[PDB]
Design a protein around this nucleic acid. Structure first.
Ligand SMILES: [Mg+2]
Ligand SMILES: [Zn+2]
Ligand SMILES: [Zn+2]
Lengths: 1336, 98, 49, 79, 50
RNA sequence: GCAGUCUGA
DNA sequence: CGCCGCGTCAGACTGCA
DNA sequence: AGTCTGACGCGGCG
């Protein structure tokens, strides 16, 4: 039907083409009888008939003469539906500037006339003249001249010139200028200017002029002379039942125009004085602008509510405009809503649906089955049979919903599992019953939630609901490969109670023939659920051939775990239940069953677990009482010790021996120590019971306290809240965050008195007000991520690439935060993984690293694996299915056609509501290695490093790195390289507050440029008494002191030059300001001695990493690899210079002087090394160390935010976003391609252009890839429907109008707008036929 | 609340809101993303065209459901045509291209 | 409200995740039956026909 | 009866292909005059279609072969 | 009459619903005493004493 | 249809 | 200095042209 | 246009 959407400016003749007649009168309807007025905003003559197939005058009333026009009144006899499509037009008596192309920064009219907006706005609103044609005078074209500067020009140059004002003047300027000549005139001024500050404006204007000439538009179309009129059924004038007419807003904003225009059409015939037609043209201009976009010119027109009228442009933008409100999501028939209720008898695939709802939702299906089975003869008879609810209607309905899934949805749908399809079990209540296991996936709890039910109508939609969306297919999370269908807080308590053991339980020690005898013994009452017993258990093991092998042996178990073995499917081991099963043990049991046996045994096992956990939690009688919160008897003692200590701190402050600062800090520290002692005493009293064993002896076992069992199961609560029930609530905080120094020494079993409670309320309301206002940030970040990534689909089985990021376990100091197995499970290797014994391939090139390959990696102890990733994927417009990895929710390689972008954005933005708002001590034993080292062996023999970016790592027995630290400049370490270390040993030492400059090779120190009083000060402190020298700073000197730079150099005992190893450049150390040197001239120094001393998160962090925002004080990186120097100084900035050995040497950096610059004149830097300490900007990382460094930086800095809160997100989902951020490139060399220099293009465009240009041996373009924030990269897509529906709609629509763009519907949103099958998933197979049958 | 079919809005031809007006539940933006994260393109197309906005598609779909034929004939939603008219009521010539 | 005899215990999953399991004698004794009064208006209009 | 389509997914190695193949066969059964190849067990045509998929009786290749054969033999019925 | 979940107590530390539950039991245990004395038709001396 | 208010998750 | 954004779904009640 | 106006945000971005 259509393959793209075209957009451009509308010619006046095109607006007359759309139109079906001119609207001349502002009257909307007739008040006497409610017929439309002739030539009104509602006119049956123009906009079509008011009733179906009848004329407005009645002279024609049936479709016998359909297509006629009546001739008594001019109304054409057609369907009334044509009132939604037929437009009108107002012929503006004067031209009128379109406010979008005038005010939507940058102003296209201003940018086209090379005229400032603050002056075009003056010319347009009749406050200044402008000269259309200059002539032989000082009346140059774009000159504005105020009226008093005009009437004197009336005589200065007569009538040889013509100056005008208003939209006529601007239209004459636009219509008069020539595009093909003006851009040609500008192209040489751009090519000739060497200050790029003007080249920016020149290329902006050249882009605009080339866009106007390339598209078919003309400039003078940015000034309306005809105004289109929306069809009247889209600004409906609803008759109120109250005897009144409720008006639209446009109907005012049109009427308000049609008056003034009409009024002006009189003043052009009455020839009224030109001042009053000036004021009327100004009013008409501002009225048309108020119609198109209200409030762009400040004070907005408001009618009758003291509230601004709604524009035409207010109809299409914002959260309430068409795009987000009616097009991207819409209300939906065959849908219902109700409260949800648990219903634990359910199976994982079904849900309870009320009969009263399933009778309404399935109504046309029921009509069909009634007419089919002869129980009715007409849809009205069947409608009567259904609304009477005869007893056969229910037998019909039980068939109509037999295998028919319904979708259940609970808003907010934070992630993919928020919509799941279940089979309806007709229940009799009014509450939708929802299986307990899917609540975690929904985030649903039964304290009043509601759900929407939707009915798939078509066979394709029912099969999609059954094969893709059914809840038995969604047991794994798409964010990470861990189960989402996990037993929760009553099943874990039931199975925790069942699996535990007690020491003298009833029936201990006996020997049982199997699990069946254990269940018989339990239900008979002859043995306890915890009787430690010997049961002969038979377990089935998967052999290599694939089949199961039975093994039978007498396990030492309890009666409970033996009973639980009856529901565990065959392929699993016994040790999976031979333990007290917490929550994590149960989720691990389910994950093991999914990995070993597959989906169907797991979906059966989950239901069996749920049933048995509920059953035995009921049998448990597990109940919380006031005696379960056992307060430790030491508490009232422990507190009354800390209350003493604060006294002997307070009596020190009253004695003035301490300031308020350290007094406050020590009081807090001792109160936190007392809090930890109280909580430790509580937990140690609570986690242990004393019981008499079989021999009558006493014996300690783990407690059976109800609070403790709920805590230890992971069922509900944790020691952090058991602490508040039975310990002390501890130090609470102020509204500002400064923690109040006297804590809540009382807990919730005792009473908090009124002051402790008031203090508690501070943090309580901070938490609640934080939750109420950070959901907005989380939702907005989720929406930005979806709209940056909506169109990314897997479109290929393999891109054939060889590169990919190197995955290593994250180490943040002494400990691993994630092993390699977490970071490579499910990825495909990019290059061969070979054993630590070199050249023996442990893993071939392209394998999907599943669990078997991953534990194979870990037992052979490989620590760094190259891995394919979406940022490195060669596929144009998509991702190949190998460069992505595993489908996390399924556990196999990803299907071709998955919308991985939406999955990534949802997986990232769903946990967003859980985020908020000196020497090195080696921990483990291993072999120490040093990397990126520039080091020296000092005169004391120990190792002293003189690098700044060197690191120190530990290597265990296996070759893997276990810990890593950063050794600063001037760090002197007390160990050797390769030296084995024990636990606790300090390896490296340094001065945290100063940098020492280090001797390279021994010899005499010799001072150069050391004139006293001008560059140096010889001083000594009365507290130190020791002489020293300090180099004069910039503030310590006048002009002439900065000219002479001090220096040192090493001169050996014969007075000759000594050379640093590697080059014959002398051993100079150039001295910085405030360099404190203690040593004297003429002394001989040794290699390794220090010459001189120079002294020194949350959700917005993720929103600022994805928006790639430059930090406040960025770390300056070395632009090229070369040799450092300092050329010139003191014009606000010191000019660092990196001269390489090859290529064009000179590069310069104007570094601010105050910035601590940790590099010196002599040493080298490589490309992208840190010149100054600080937070790196991501743009600079991308520019200087490649896309791999910037994706590694963003992945790590986002996962440092998510891991802090315990959130797990597989980092594919982050690379998928980074791939969409660095999606644009910038042409650095045009090559033989058509892109102009410095122009930002799509990366896929330039890459395929290089491909096709290298296809015939020519030279292809070269580029620098950009990094854009998610908002800027969302608004810079090739689609204007994906970027106009996101945000900033007027910008996107005006730039796509003046550019003449074309949206070819290649994304997911473009096809959702227009009602098509998305190119993802089951629509992908369609969207390919559409291509392989239209591109041929 | 439940609704198979009922009255529809006037400008956009989508269903009304709330059990007072016989409702119809909003399939908002996040639910459209949730369907896009599955491959449920046909479910999504029927949520967009024949359940709400398509004015011919929904009557054809109703007669099909009654006739035991679970097949949609989806066209263009009426809101998209409303959006085209509202963008053409600016000075901007947006147009479907074949 | 009314004084109900509550026990604190998990019962076969019917009190799962903030749910409440009520005996039938709380419905028989009408302990929580409430009366609601709805006002419906039928306004006779003057129409042009 | 059908509770999980995992068996029918190994036979048609894609989930977005299972939906299209099963919907084509289910429409052949629902509005065509065609009969199931498995015993109709009081199922819907969608579930019958999936039960045919999982027993190797139906895939897109078999559907195309059968449609080709029926098209040719109905073109043969022209006297 | 109603069965509530104990796992809603220790997570959200609303212990006041346990103590109330223990007091509302005691406060009813007194009632069941008087209900006995009113059914045995004890003297008002014994009722007043209790 | 809109605005205001309140509420629920 | 002006412009652009600032979660989702839902129920109720008024008053308004 | 006179208000016996409202303002009384914030944080990026260009
Ligand atoms: Mg809830
Ligand atoms: Zn007529
Ligand atoms: Zn790839």
């Amino acid at each position: 039907e259509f393959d793209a959407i075209k957009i451009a400016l509308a010619s006046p003749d095109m607006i007359r083409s759309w139109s079906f007649g001119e609207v001349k009168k502002p009257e909307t309807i007739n008040y006497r009888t409610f017929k439309p007025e002739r030539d009104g905003l509602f006119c049956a003559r123009i906009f079509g008939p008011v009733k179906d197939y009848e004329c407005l005058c009645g002279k024609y009333k049936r479709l016998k003469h359909r297509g006629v026009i009546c001739e008594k009144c001019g109304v054409e006899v057609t369907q009334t539906k044509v009132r939604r499509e037929r437009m009108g037009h107002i012929e503006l008596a004067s031209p009128t500037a379109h406010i979008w192309f005038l005010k939507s920064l940058p102003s296209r009219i201003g940018l086209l006339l090379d005229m400032p907006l603050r002056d075009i706005e003056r010319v347009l609103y009749f406050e200044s003249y402008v000269v259309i044609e200059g002539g032989m005078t000082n009346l140059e074209r774009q000159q504005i001249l105020t009226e008093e500067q005009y009437l004197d020009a009336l005589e200065e140059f007569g009538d040889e010139f013509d100056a005008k004002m208003g939209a006529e003047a601007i239209q004459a300027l636009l219509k008069s200028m020539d595009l093909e000549q003006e851009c040609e005139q500008l192209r040489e001024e751009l090519n000739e200017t060497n200050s790029e500050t003007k080249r920016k404006k020149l290329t902006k204007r050249i882009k605009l002029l080339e866009a106007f000439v390339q598209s078919g538009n003309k400039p003078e179309w940015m000034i309306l002379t005809v105004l289109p009129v929306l069809p009247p059924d889209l600004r409906p004038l609803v008759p109120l039942d109250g005897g009144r007419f409720a008006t639209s807003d446009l109907n005012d904003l049109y009427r308000r125009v049609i008056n003034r225009n009409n009024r002006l059409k009189r003043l052009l015939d009455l020839a009224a004085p030109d001042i009053i037609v000036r004021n009327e043209k100004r009013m008409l201009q501002e009225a048309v602008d108020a119609l198109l976009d209200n409030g762009r010119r400040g004070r907005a027109i408001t009618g009758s509510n003291k509230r601004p009228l709604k524009s035409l442009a207010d109809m299409i933008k914002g959260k309430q405009g068409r795009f987000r409100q009616n097009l991207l999501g819409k209300r939906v028939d065959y849908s219902g809503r109700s409260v949800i209720t648990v219903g634990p008898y359910l199976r994982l695939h079904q849900c309870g649906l009320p009969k009263k709802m399933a009778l309404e939702l399935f109504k046309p299906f029921i009509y069909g089955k009634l007419e089919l089975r002869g129980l009715a003869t007409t849809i009205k008879a069947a409608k009567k049979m259904v609304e009477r609810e005869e007893a056969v209607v229910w037998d019909i309905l039980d068939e109509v919903i037999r295998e028919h899934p319904v979708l259940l949805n609970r808003a907010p749908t934070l992630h993919r599992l928020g919509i799941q399809a279940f089979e309806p079990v007709l229940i009799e209540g009014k509450a939708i019953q929802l299986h307990p296991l899917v609540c975690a996936a929904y985030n649903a709890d039964f304290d009043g939630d509601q759900m929407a039910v939707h009915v798939p109508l078509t066979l394709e939609a029912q099969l999609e609901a059954r094969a893709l969306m059914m809840s038995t297919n969604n047991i794994l999370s798409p964010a990470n490969g861990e189960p989402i269908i996990v037993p929760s807080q009553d099943v874990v308590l039931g199975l925790y109670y069942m699996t535990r053991d007690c020491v003298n339980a009833k029936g201990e020690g006996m020997v049982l023939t199997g699990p069946k005898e254990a269940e018989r013994l339990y239900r008979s009452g002859l043995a306890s659920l915890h009787a430690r017993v010997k049961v002969r258990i038979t377990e089935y093991e998967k052999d290599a051939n694939g089949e199961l092998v039975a093994k039978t042996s007498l396990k030492d178990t309890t009666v409970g775990r033996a009973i639980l073995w009856m529901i565990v499917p065959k392929g699993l081991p016994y040790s999976i239940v031979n333990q007290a099963l917490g929550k994590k043990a149960i989720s691990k049991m389910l994950n093991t069953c999914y990995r070993i046996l597959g989906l169907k045994p797991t979906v059966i096992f989950a239901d069996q677990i749920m049933y048995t956990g509920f059953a035995y939690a009921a049998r448990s009688g597990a109940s919380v009482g006031i005696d379960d919160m056992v307060i430790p008897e030491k508490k009232h003692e422990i507190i009354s010790e800390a209350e003493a200590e604060v006294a002997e701190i307070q009596e020190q402050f009253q004695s003035g021996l301490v300031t308020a600062g350290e007094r406050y800090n020590k009081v807090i520290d001792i109160w936190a120590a007392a809090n930890d002692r109280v909580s430790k005493a509580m937990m140690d009293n609570l986690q242990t019971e004393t019981v008499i064993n079989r021999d009558g002896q006493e014996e300690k076992q783990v407690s059976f306290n109800s609070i403790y069992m709920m805590a230890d199961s992971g069922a509900r609560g944790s020691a952090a809240q058991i602490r508040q029930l039975a310990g002390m609530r501890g130090l609470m905080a102020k509204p500002d965050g400064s923690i109040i120094e006297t804590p809540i020494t009382a807990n919730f079993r005792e009473g908090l008195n009124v002051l402790q409670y008031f203090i508690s309320t501070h943090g309580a309301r901070k938490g609640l007000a934080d939750t109420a206002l950070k959901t907005a940030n989380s939702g907005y970040l989720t929406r930005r991520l979806v709209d940056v990534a909506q169109d990314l689909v897997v479109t290929e089985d393999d891109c054939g690439t060889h590169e990919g990021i190197m995955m290593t376990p994250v180490i943040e100091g002494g400990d691993v935060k994630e092993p390699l197995r977490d970071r490579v499970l499910g990825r495909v290797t990019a290059e061969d993984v070979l054993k630590p014994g070199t050249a023996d391939i442990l893993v071939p090139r392209n394998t999907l690293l599943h669990e078997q390959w991953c534990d194979l990696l870990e037992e052979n102890s490989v620590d760094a694996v190259k891995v394919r990733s979406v940022v490195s994927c060669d596929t144009d417009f998509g991702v190949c299915a190998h460069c992505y990895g595993r489908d996390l929710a399924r556990g196999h390689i990803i299907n071709k056609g998955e919308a991985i972008g939406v999955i990534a954005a949802q997986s990232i933005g769903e946990p967003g509501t859980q985020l908020t708002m000196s020497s090195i001590q080696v921990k483990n034993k291993g072999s120490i290695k040093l990397s990126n080292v520039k080091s020296v062996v000092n005169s004391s023999g120990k190792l002293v490093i003189t690098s700044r970016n060197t690191e120190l790592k530990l290597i265990d027995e296996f070759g893997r790195t276990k810990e890593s630290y950063k050794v600063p400049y001037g760090a002197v370490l007390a160990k050797g390289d390769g030296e084995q270390v024990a636990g606790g040993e300090t390896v490296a030492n340094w001065d945290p507050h100063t940098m020492p400059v280090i001797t390279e090779v021994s010899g005499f120190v010799r001072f150069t440029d050391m004139i006293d009083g001008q560059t140096i000060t010889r001083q000594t402190d009365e507290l130190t008494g020791l002489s020293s020298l300090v180099v004069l700073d910039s503030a310590e000197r006048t002009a002439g002191g900065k000219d002479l730079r001090p220096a040192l150099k090493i001169v050996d005992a014969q007075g000759n030059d000594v050379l640093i190893p590697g080059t014959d450049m002398p051993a100079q150390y150039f001295l910085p300001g405030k360099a404190i040197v203690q040593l004297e001239d003429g002394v001989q120094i040794s290699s390794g001695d220090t010459l001189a001393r120079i002294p020194q998160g949350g959700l917005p962090r993720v929103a600022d990493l994805f928006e790639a925002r430059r930090p406040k004080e960025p770390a300056i990186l070395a632009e090229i690899s070369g040799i450092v120097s300092f050329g010139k100084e003191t014009k606000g900035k010191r000019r660092l210079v990196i001269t390489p050995v090859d290529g064009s040497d000179p590069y310069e950096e104007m570094i601010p002087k105050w910035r601590q610059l940790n590099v010196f004149e002599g040493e080298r830097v490589e490309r992208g090394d840190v010149i100054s300490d600080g937070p790196e900007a991501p743009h600079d990382i991308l520019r200087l160390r490649g896309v791999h460094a910037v994706t590694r930086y963003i992945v790590n800095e986002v996962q440092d935010v998510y891991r802090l809160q315990g959130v797990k997100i597989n980092d594919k989902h982050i690379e998928v976003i980074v791939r969409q951020m660095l999606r644009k490139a910038t042409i650095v060399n045009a090559g033989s391609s058509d892109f102009l220099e410095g122009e930002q293009v799509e990366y896929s465009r330039v890459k395929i252009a290089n491909r096709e240009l290298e296809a015939n041996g020519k030279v292809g373009a070269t580029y620098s890839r950009d990094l854009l924030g998610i908002t800027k990269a969302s608004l810079a897509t090739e689609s204007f429907i994906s970027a106009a529906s996101f945000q900033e709609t007027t910008r996107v629509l005006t730039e796509a109008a003046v550019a003449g763009k074309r949206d070819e519907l290649r994304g997911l949103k473009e096809n959702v707008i227009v009602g098509r099958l998305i190119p993802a998933g089951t629509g992908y197979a369609y969207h390919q036929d559409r291509m392989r049958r239209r591109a041929a | 609340h439940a609704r198979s079919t009922g009255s529809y809005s006037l400008v956009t031809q989508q269903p009304l809101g709330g059990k007072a007006q016989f409702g119809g539940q909003r399939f908002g933006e996040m639910e459209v993303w949730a369907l896009e994260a599955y491959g449920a393109a046909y479910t999504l197309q029927e949520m967009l065209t024949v359940k709400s906005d398509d004015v011919n598609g929904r009557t054809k779909m109703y007669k099909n459901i009654v006739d035991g034929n679970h097949q949609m004939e989806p066209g263009m939603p009426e809101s998209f045509n409303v959006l085209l008219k509202e963008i053409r009521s600016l000075g901007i010539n947006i147009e479907l291209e074949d | 409200g009314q004084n109900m005899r509550v026990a604190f215990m998990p019962w076969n999953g019917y009190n799962f995740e903030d749910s409440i399991l009520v005996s039938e004698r709380v419905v028989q004794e009408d302990r929580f039956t409430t009366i609601h009064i709805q006002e419906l208006a039928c306004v006779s209009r003057d129409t042009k026909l | 009866a059908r509770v999980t389509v995992q068996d029918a997914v190994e036979k048609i190695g894609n989930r977005f292909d299972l939906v299209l193949v099963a919907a084509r066969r289910a429409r052949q059964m629902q509005v065509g005059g065609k009969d199931p190849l498995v015993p109709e067990e009081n199922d819907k045509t969608t579930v019958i279609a999936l039960r045919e998929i999982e027993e190797g009786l139906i895939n897109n290749q078999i559907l195309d072969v059968r449609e080709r054969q029926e098209q040719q033999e109905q073109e043969a019925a022209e006297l | 009459d109603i069965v509530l979940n104990p796992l809603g107590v220790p997570s959200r530390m609303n212990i006041g619903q346990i103590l109330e539950t223990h007091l509302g039991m005691a406060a009813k245990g007194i009632g069941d005493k008087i209900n006995a004395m009113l059914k045995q038709q004890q003297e008002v001396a014994k009722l007043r004493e209790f």
